[PDB]
Design a protein around this ligand. Structure first.
Ligand SMILES: O=C(O)[C@H]1O[C@@H](O)[C@H](O)[C@@H](O)[C@@H]1O
Ligand SMILES: O=C(O)[C@H]1O[C@@H](O)[C@H](O)[C@@H](O)[C@@H]1O
Lengths: 675, 675
């Protein structure tokens, strides 16, 4: 019914087989059982072998051994250096006898991640005669957030309907949820929230007996793949389901009601991860409704979960969603830092502030949120958007891994040089107890799971970066393409090229120089330069007949640059050093202002919009050269979306070029067609 | 549960009573019974009298006599001149004996309209000692179109939910539908379509046995008040409910299926009015879907209804709803004439083309649709929009009667001078068998029926103009206000002033000089200059840094002016004679172009937007001076909307002024505040 994505386990030829007679499973916990089952599946499918599962080694049998440190006869120095619970070692025995592969995990989940790594090696055709591998995740939380509603819709879902819910209930049975867990665990994802952060009427009851048995069945499947389950919650639940007159977190009965709710959930799900919370945002209720701050409001929930080891993931996407467009002092980009930096040191230790990559809202380019690096005493995790709300909605190709690496490698200088975002959220810089990264799911019930076949690369790559942010975009694309489309070197170079250039191509024909937006309101797809320009969401470009851009300087504008540490604040504050790609985010400038590229701002706009369309056509041409080397169905699936992309890109190009010709009155340098 | 609107029948003082002992009802048909009942109701409520109903006159009793010509002992010369079936005469007997009032109708419905006229006279405090009145409607069809959906919603409904439907069924019982019929009949409305022109899945079945008993119960109530019932239909019904493979009107089985459907409906409703049809518009299905023209498609339905006397009301709101904004040759304003003028002479005589007042879509100002006067061989009726989709959505006050009179009195010169639109649609100019006017309903389940209490004036005035287009706006406002709020001369002058100036006030702060639109897409409420400017609906202003407007001239633009007869075409074709209020509909001009008013276009925009807000404040101030002379509830109801209006008007003013300062770079002459 659906694609295997990157877990194809394609049958090898006769020159690429392995000889094994036994799999040694030293434990029989559900996680180990899932790990053995994946190994049997991959070996049968790739190697056409079915080794017998045993729980003690046969000293003359060729085998793969699965165990933790405490199951080892001899604990060797490599595995002895593991410190992370989900770490593992893979090593080939250097005896001249039988062939042995040891997969040694610090814990059961480490064996599962090691089993997927070993199968990854086989899919990629790597020689395993002499493996010596050690792997430990850098981020403790490696999470997916679902925006799924129980009516089956998905908020900002471009890949079909919910695979969890339909008709205000759980889908019964679950085979697809198991394969989804396999996919998530294969790239190391260890946590999931199954319901929309906008928690509506039915979804509020997910924390009540009416639905907890269903929640628990889903949690049972994920637990087997090392994944902890979370629920997004309605902060006003004490009123809406508890019959309380208030949801004030300082009200004693409210506090008790959340404690009782927590106790009840842990009776159904003893390892429940915790709650995700959108509060006091976009008209969703929160502590502010009762005159309290977010430390008071998070802490109350945190105390309810604390006896059970749960976590509060408190989202920092908070801002004035009723801004007066006339008010040029108010800057939405400043809101999250101004709201949360003052609260550093006031939160309970099982609270994690979840912060999007940028301070606005997942635009094709945004500078990094200044909150990263600014709260040494508070756990932080980054939120990225795998579903492409403003990056093409899986109609346009957009591999997001390069952008995420830019954010992850951005140096905040919080503790001087070498204070990259990745060190903030991996908890090493400030010693955070809990931290990491989360991504808003791009899947849905479409058979290819992500809408665009090539958007599978974004779910894959999210997981790889969450495991190790230092992985290059090039090697992540290489692994994904080889596993999903095979190892033909023309196929590999071509799709890797498409992926790696796709984000830049889409940026080129959409909003210029980091100013964001210029999208149709509502569904957010396609060009509309003035779409929100006189609205109340805080999203303005201020374009007029002379110039464009948001003045966020301290010298003459909103002062947003001061939220950065001095090295970055100065870079952005000055007109002459601000990087071109963010210029209009930080400065209001005349259309004739000359960029570092030598282009005027206006001619830059024309150039990237004309040239972006030419690059999308090139994306399609290169895919077409792969006909015959890709199966017909996926070939045509992707080709159809690239053609949709090329046609829509022409619209972006012409709407933006005409808008700006109409305003600026300045013609294209090269005389190209502006309507 | 709801307001009586203009049928308050307020108790008179002791110096304003009438003495009657009998009502003489010469017939006992349902219409007469409804007429007697209304007279008893009004006399009891106003006069505190309950004359006995009798069916033969008592020669010594003071009485009101109700009958048709054939019930008269003596048929007098006045009533003898009646020719229209719904005409009536009211005359006081000039005998010195008992007091007698005769209400003599050409038919039963004429007696009902005469009964409402007589009660209108009493409400207004007129001396009835010596009445001699003759009244005959000018428009044969005086119709209301409902945009009600069976889920209870109303498309472009700003006055609550449907009073007909809820939960995909009919509301059972019906008292409110009876009072609604009383209101419609009091202003002479004689036809109604109860369901949205956009006919969705459930609504398609309104022509099937599953719902026809319900339709018929509603039709029974309306029939008693002289109103014929119509249904809007889904042109694709032969496929969606009939199981046919096509809905091609030339397919023999499709033709038969509509004949059978017509026969079945007339078994439930023997005087069924007919069908309203939106076809080949806004993605709704029609003949074009099968490669046929609208004469072929209307005629097929017309033949199905013909044996039963039904009518096909075929809407002319047809256009390219997938226009390329780049294509400046295509002009949505030309579409209806180009589609239907070629078909003159091809339609069956029980087809009526229903044409909106203007060629775009009910904007605050549009020139008159050129189809009026252009089809001597085809019945035409005009469609107006009583619900205020683009004229303030009943948040802003907008009495539409002055605009409708401008359209009605517009001289097409189709047969030389004196070829006003009103003569086209009343059928006198071309001898149409069936013709008239329809209005899209502004009511809903709100207790005050129209959302804005003062929008009741629009339903009232629609009906009065449909009866007699020559009535002045001043006397319609005077009648409505006196009946709804009483006769205090400060109350009367004030509300009449508010009504009569409201449309101009709202135009002043919305789109300038007839160009239309500049509304938020989707719900269509409030300012958004570029809202549809790069969309596919054909609605562009072409504003740039130098100028604005649609060039619809023959000399250099779309040639739309040529659709008018020569006298109007030349007026609009020339830059110097085109009236200011339509200038940007017809010409693209520089912001510095000087109007007949002496204003430049840009300064005109600034002036009317600043001054419009000052006029809305004045609307509120004048209503406030009426406190104490209006009941508290309606006083506060209206005041709340006027305050909403004033605040929203400030938004319109500032968004449009800033947009145009940003584009034009030209400051306000007077130095007023432009953000
Ligand atoms: O992050 C959030 O909560 C919000 O992000 C926006 O990008 C999106 O339009 C919303 O659907 C969502 O609820
Ligand atoms: O007249 C029509 O059919 C259409 O008129 C528009 O003014 C309105 O936006 C639509 O809701 C409607 O269906």
């Amino acid at each position: 019914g659906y694609e295997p994505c990157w877990l194809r386990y394609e049958r090898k030829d006769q020159y690429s087989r392995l000889r094994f007679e036994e799999i040694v499973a030293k434990r029989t916990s559900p996680i180990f059982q899932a790990a053995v089952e994946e190994l049997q599946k991959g070996l049968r499918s790739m190697m056409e072998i079915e080794p017998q599962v045993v729980q003690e080694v046969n000293e003359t049998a060729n085998s793969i051994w699965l165990g933790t440190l405490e199951d080892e006869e001899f604990e060797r120095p490599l595995e002895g250096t593991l410190v992370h619970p989900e770490g593992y070692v893979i090593r080939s025995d250097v005896d001249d006898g039988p062939f042995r592969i040891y997969i040694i995990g610090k814990t059961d989940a480490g064996v599962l991640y090691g089993v997927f790594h070993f199968l990854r090696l086989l899919q990629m055709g790597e020689n395993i005669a002499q493996l010596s591998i050690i792997e430990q995740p850098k981020n403790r939380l490696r999470m997916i957030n679902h925006w799924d509603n129980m009516d089956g819709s998905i908020e900002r879902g471009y890949a079909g309907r919910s695979i969890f819910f339909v008709d205000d209930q759980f889908v019964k049975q679950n085979q697809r949820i198991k394969d989804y867990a396999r996919l998530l665990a294969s790239v190391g994802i260890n946590a999931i929230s199954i319901n929309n952060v906008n928690v509506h009427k039915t979804e509020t009851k997910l924390i009540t007996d009416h639905f907890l048995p269903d929640v628990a069945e889903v949690a049972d499947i994920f637990r087997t793949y090392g994944i902890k389950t979370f629920l997004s919650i309605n902060y006003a639940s004490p009123i809406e389901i508890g019959g309380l007159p208030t949801a004030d977190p300082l009200d004693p009965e409210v506090r008790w009601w959340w404690k009782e709710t927590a106790k009840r959930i842990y009776q159904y799900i003893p390892d429940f991860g915790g709650f995700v919370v959108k509060a006091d945002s976009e008209f969703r209720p929160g502590p502010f409704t009762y005159g309290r701050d977010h430390a008071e409001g998070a802490n109350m929930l945190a105390e309810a979960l604390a006896p059970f080891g749960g976590l509060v993931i408190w989202r920092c996407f908070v801002y004035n969603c009723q801004q007066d467009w006339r008010d040029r002092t108010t800057d939405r980009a400043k809101a999250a830092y101004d709201h949360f930096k003052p609260l550093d040191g006031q939160f309970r230790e099982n609270v994690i502030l979840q912060i999007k990559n940028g301070p606005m809202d997942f635009q094709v380019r945004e500078p990094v949120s200044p909150l990263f690096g600014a709260m040494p005493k508070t756990n932080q995790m980054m939120e990225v958007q795998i579903t492409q709300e403003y990056t093409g909605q899986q109609k346009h190709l957009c591999f997001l891994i390069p952008q995420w690496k830019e954010v992850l490698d951005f140096d905040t200088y919080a503790k001087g040089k070498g204070s990259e975002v990745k060190k903030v959220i991996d908890g090493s810089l400030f010693d955070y107890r809990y931290s990491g990264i989360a991504g808003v799911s791009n899947i849905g019930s479409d058979p290819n799971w992500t809408g665009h076949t090539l958007a599978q690369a974004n779910l894959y790559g999210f997981g790889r970066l969450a495991w190790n942010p230092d992985l290059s975009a090039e090697e992540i694309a290489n692994e994904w393409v080889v596993q999903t489309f095979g190892d033909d070197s023309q196929v590999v170079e071509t799709i890797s090229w498409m992926l790696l250039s796709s984000w830049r191509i889409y940026e080129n024909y959409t909003s210029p120089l980091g100013v964001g937006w210029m999208v149709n309101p509502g569904h957010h797809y396609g060009p509309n330069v003035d779409g929100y320009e006189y609205s109340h969401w805080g999203t303005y470009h201020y374009a007029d007949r002379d110039g464009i851009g948001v003045d966020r300087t301290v010298a003459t504008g909103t002062g947003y640059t001061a939220q950065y540490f001095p090295e970055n604040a100065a870079m952005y504050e000055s007109l002459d050093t601000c990087p071109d790609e963010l210029l209009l985010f930080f400065h209001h400038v005349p259309y004739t202002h000359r960029l570092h590229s030598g282009e005027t701002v206006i001619q830059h706009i024309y150039n990237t919009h004309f040239e972006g369309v030419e690059q999308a056509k090139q994306l399609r041409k290169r895919w077409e050269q792969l006909k015959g080397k890709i199966d017909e169905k996926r070939y045509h699936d992707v080709l159809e979306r690239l053609t949709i992309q090329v046609e829509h890109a022409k619209e972006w190009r012409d709407v933006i070029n005409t808008y700006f010709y109409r305003k600026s009155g300045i013609d294209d340098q090269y005389g190209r067609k502006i309507y």
